[PDB]
Symmetry: D3
Subunit: 294 residues, 6 copies
Amino acid sequence: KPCNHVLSLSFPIRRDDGSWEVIEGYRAQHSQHRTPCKGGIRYSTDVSVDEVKALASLMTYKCAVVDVPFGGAKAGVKINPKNYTDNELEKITRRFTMELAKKGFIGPGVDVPAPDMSTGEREMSWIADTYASTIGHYDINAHACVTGKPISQGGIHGRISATGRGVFHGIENFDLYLNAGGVTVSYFEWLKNLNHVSYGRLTFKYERDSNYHLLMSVQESLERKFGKHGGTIPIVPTAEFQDRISGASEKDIVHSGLAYTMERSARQIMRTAMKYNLGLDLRTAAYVNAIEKV
Amino acid sequence: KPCNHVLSLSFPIRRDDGSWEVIEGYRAQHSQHRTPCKGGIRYSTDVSVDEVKALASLMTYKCAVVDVPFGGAKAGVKINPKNYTDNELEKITRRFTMELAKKGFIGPGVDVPAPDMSTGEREMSWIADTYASTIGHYDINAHACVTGKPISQGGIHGRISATGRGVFHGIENFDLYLNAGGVTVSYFEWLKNLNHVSYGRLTFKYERDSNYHLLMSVQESLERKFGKHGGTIPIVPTAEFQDRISGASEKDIVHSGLAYTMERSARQIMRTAMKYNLGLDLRTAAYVNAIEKV
Amino acid sequence: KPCNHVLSLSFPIRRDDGSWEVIEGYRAQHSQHRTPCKGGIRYSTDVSVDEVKALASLMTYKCAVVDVPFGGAKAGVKINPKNYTDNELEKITRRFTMELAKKGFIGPGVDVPAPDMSTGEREMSWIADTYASTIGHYDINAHACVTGKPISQGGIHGRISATGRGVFHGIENFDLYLNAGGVTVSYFEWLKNLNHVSYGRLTFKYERDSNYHLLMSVQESLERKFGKHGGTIPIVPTAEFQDRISGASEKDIVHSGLAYTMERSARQIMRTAMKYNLGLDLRTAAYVNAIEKV
Amino acid sequence: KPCNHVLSLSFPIRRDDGSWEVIEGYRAQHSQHRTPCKGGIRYSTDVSVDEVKALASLMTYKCAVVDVPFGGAKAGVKINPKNYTDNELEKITRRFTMELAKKGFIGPGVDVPAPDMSTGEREMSWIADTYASTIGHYDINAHACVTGKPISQGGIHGRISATGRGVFHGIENFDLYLNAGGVTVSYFEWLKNLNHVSYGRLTFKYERDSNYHLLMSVQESLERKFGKHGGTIPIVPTAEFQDRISGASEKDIVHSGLAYTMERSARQIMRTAMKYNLGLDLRTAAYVNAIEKV
Amino acid sequence: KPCNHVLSLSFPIRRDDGSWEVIEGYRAQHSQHRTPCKGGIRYSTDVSVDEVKALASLMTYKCAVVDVPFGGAKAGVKINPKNYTDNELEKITRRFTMELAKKGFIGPGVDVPAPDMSTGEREMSWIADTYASTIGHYDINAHACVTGKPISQGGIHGRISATGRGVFHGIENFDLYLNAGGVTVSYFEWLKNLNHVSYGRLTFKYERDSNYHLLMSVQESLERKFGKHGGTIPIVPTAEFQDRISGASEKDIVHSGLAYTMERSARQIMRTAMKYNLGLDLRTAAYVNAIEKV
Amino acid sequence: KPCNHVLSLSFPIRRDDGSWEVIEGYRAQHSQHRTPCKGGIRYSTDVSVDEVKALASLMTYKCAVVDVPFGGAKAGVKINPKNYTDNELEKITRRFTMELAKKGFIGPGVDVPAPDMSTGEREMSWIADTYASTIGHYDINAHACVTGKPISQGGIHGRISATGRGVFHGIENFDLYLNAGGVTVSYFEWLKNLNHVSYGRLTFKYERDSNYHLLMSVQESLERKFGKHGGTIPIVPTAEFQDRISGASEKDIVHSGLAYTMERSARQIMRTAMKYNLGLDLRTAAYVNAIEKV
């Protein structure tokens, strides 16, 4: 129920006009039983220690809903991002990564941060370049230290739509559940980085040649009936399936992993309200279900 | 032929009534040419150094039969497990993990232990929590340090039936061979842990939508012949195949990996008795075949 | 444009008749933005620092063409391999691995060397055994420290044909592009080593049973039309597809990954000459395309 | 002025009657500019985060007074030590060491804890055995991870009197200054542990034979004047000096290092009130002097 | 005779007006038989690879003259320091430290750099803060990573006069020899940092009380002759000796270590020209003597 | 009473005529409570596991007698050294170091081996170069990995006479005690290596100038009595004391540390037979005394 580890920080920065400023930041890790911990960084004046603690507990229970094997974590850095040039926002981000890293609050097997509304993919690149260039130079998994990175830096396709797409797939099955599409795809991104290759890379051509052989096999079976030469035409794929094969990419595998996730989590939550026999409240069912797993 | 490394140990425990006891234990690693080494822990009074050495050699040759890229290892701890409360059995296990760990006799790239009849999955959880909480906190692969864990801790589906199921698949092809189904699935568990995701997780929904497109493609090919609207029905899967798609899980992939393993090992052993032309003895063929690879 | 890191070396060896010899060697790493770096070792008298620097830049741009996420690297050791017995060629190789390793110029997350015409797979085994037995004993990825190894040591199937096969697939789509088939398969080998299992190992039996179910499903769909018992025979695969299923191995997956690679790189290079609208020169298009990505 | 790092913790313990209890603890590190950080652990119900933060700042300024090159740190564990058997007090201490260690809040180059009134030398042994047996097994400096240990475990002679003795030497020169005798001797203990040998061990016999030669040399100089055989007797040491030589131990060197420390710090504080020309207030002089150095 | 390792580098910096600049740098390590290597960093346009190689060989032979157990090393960064603001000179220095560190060309057990005419103590602080804050945070010896630091950062007293003072002591005994006073004191600084305490810190008060006891002992020996009470006064020290005891500091121990060094090296060089019987050339004697030891 | 860890090994070597040989070796560590462990390596056919175990227990108790803070250890390699050329004896030694190193049976904070009658200082150099060049390249303490090295490699002066000299000093005070002079000086060698400077290096000139000032101070005290100019001559040292000052080296400090050791151990053993009041048996007194400390 409480957080295993909460790291409060203060670090100095040179403001861009030469002024001196102390930056205060936090990261709470919740359940070390599940490693790595996973969670976003918020830049706001409103960030307090108890907020990140509250959000790291909720992240644990959200990861458990969708069977993402991460512990909960949350960070916040008390700044108003609109008052800082992008110069210093690099320094604030870079140094904050550095102070968490020394203390074991960031790493691919330890704690994997994510963006928030206040935090973008460019802050993810800085966090990733920081770790990769100091603590994690020799680590092969260093580019799994953070998720929400841009494609060129190890990001993943289908991340923009992930939460909106998961809300959709969550309902079609029918906050702790519908909102877990971003958590799920961040897990896929972390896996992709650990895999060092994109999904399907080796499998697409193999599959498509297997799909051809099966339609080609159905002809020579139907032609052993009625005498022809390529005369009956099972050989051909349909229109939406040919544009499936010629377009198959990483984001297709991310879509199906996310759909299979939101599908399987919805049947467990229903089974959770088929045991206590809760009513139409799916909230308490999801928490009962998440706490059950944790 | 002999063991590269044999670690003999003695460590004190406080007995549960306050008594003092020295616990004696062993782990033999056989071939360091193949890393990690892999093998079970026995709790028996009968465990001797030469026993674990004998069983670590045999494990090397058994892993080579089925093309499991592990070296052989074996451990034993000289205790009668029935004389100890589960309290101290935790301490004996935990400390024994700790003393092997310091010396490089346990780790996911080093040596991966397994249970025996005397050793269960709860001892695997203790070994895993011990390593993960001391030596392996920052290691991303720390939960691959041991196999035979429970599903909630990183175990694998289809482990209960693995040896019985492999005996079956080994014969249908037709001790060092038939008994390797547990060795094979422990390898799959170790891979699963290294993968950090369960098998099929991302692939099931993608495959099932590919399977639908192919039956849907065979209609619109047969309907371009005879004029209809969805009138001829290739669209539908058969009864055992629909319960394949709607039920596909990790243990289905474990089953097929194990079957493909026992199948491929049986054809190599037959080819091994098609070279020397041994007779119906498949034993010496399997050893010739294992020593050949090692 | 220049190399981030160039390591010049000198190390003594005892010649095989007792003489004393200083061996001079180099490794240039090009872009640390992309890790690990990847490149071959040349044994020649002609090897100079500026040569390996030139070839490490070109390797970066060649890896970027085919979307192999490696930085460029190159090594050379100034010796005429024909003047040394295989005894000392082991020592020269082994010690050179050792001096690069101490300095972070060889490792699976750092720098992954490959053979050249002057360098074989036996030198890869020595490099791999050296790293695995000193620096990388506890590293789980130590056998990814080098590519071009023999199958028994972690090599990959389809490496002999990789460059010749990629030249072919590169043209059928229509030096920096056609020559990247070896670079691509070395990436697949590195991935295989990081995966610790061969490609398809778990997937072949599963796929083949899925392929059977689909042809078996097309019968019971065509037999729900015309009354029979197994009378119409979609069940059967064609002749080249049955020898696909019964023969499916790792090299089939390597072939398709390589074809999918050379296919996707050719469409990007064409799109690169559909933007500037270069003419039939595909060279400058490939460099524009590689520099674009880097 | 604020603390660089504050680690808040919660960890479960099994109470000695089987009950379940969450233990809350803190460690604040103040100035990372000076490493390692140094400070005590308090067991009290009164321990709060702001208390340990306040006491870690003061410890920084106290170490700077006496030129002890440590940063400030403080820990507290919110428990009433009188409600726990020594059994669980071992577990609370041991696990708290373990959770700080994973996060880089305990170590000989990182953070070196000390006792308090609530914390004894037996808790120091547990902290030291914990670190030495998990995180620090291969660290040569692992027994410098904590100070205030018992002599048999690496403690130091003259620690019991250190603070009382420093109060004395501080006044004879004439809270932040007089109280620094324990801080100073803990630094000497940390040095002793880093030295791996006790003070004087190699120097006592050498010095005493040098002292003999000098008195023996003064004879043969006075006897070259007046004719004798060993007749005039400079040879002999005085009574308090002979019991100096025959008794010289580590605590004699600790005494003089502490006296030389309290002596040199008093002249700097006086010089600090000879610059601003503060009056008889030596407090503000000591803070001006400590902040000056930091 | 040649250098074991030469690291050539290029790294980008943002110029202070926004321009982009590639900075080229080198470090040659000479004899790895002696670790750590030791040598200065030059900032000049004139720095070439063969220059730093030449100066790293000479540094090896200079360290061997005075029995400083360091290997030779040298660095240079090709820039004109007068064209850069101190802002970017921090970045050039900081990043250059970072690129050497990743490759094992800077560290307290590896390679310890020093200043030159072009390089000051503020560049030493940046190098030291860089290492201590990235690679060496947990290293207890991280502040030994570089010498020539300022006293507040771990510098040593008597460094300003070291070379001028060694030239003096070298002659009073009577380039590779007379110039080794800075090399010798840098070794003392490195030792001081490894000791974590300044020289004499614990020994001054102890010695002075031993010196008092000996003069006090000579009285009570001369007073056992002629009857008095404190009447004859051996008790008192002379004028230059009392200002020795009341002033004794670290730089007194550095002076004597340096004098004892230049004294012992001069007698070995003379003995080197008493074996070949070279003439008044002390140069070739010093090289014969240095090569002899190496 | 038993050994905490016993490592049995087998490793292949190529015999010098091309033959193949498996070499069997052992190292027993006794008490991990005291780290590092310390003990010699024997090359004999007679070496058995129980022998090295017996000798590692005795080494623990011998180190405790003389207050050398090492645990006991012992190694043996079953070979007749007279049947091997020095070529292969390098390989046997080098590889045996390598296999112990991987397993944490050799290191400066772990286990520090020593020679035996069968093992020399050249085997110590090989062990040291092996560790320093693989496992311990970046370790600053790597040259403390072994004792009994030659002076040029980090050996210590006064090691040849250490055991004979300790037998002498042990008796002058009046097997487990008299034989501990080699154990004591090996501890001094290990300390010297950890210190990275030889004993007295910085202290000799300082001391000698302090000794001069004291004799010079006794004049100006005796001359304030009787009117002279340098007329009375306390200034001069005696004949054995001047050859003390002009000859003072490391072996003088080793002598006095060893004498102070054998002196202090003899008074504890006498006090051990003044408590039980054993008779003239000093054996059982020494064991009672050693077991008391352990």
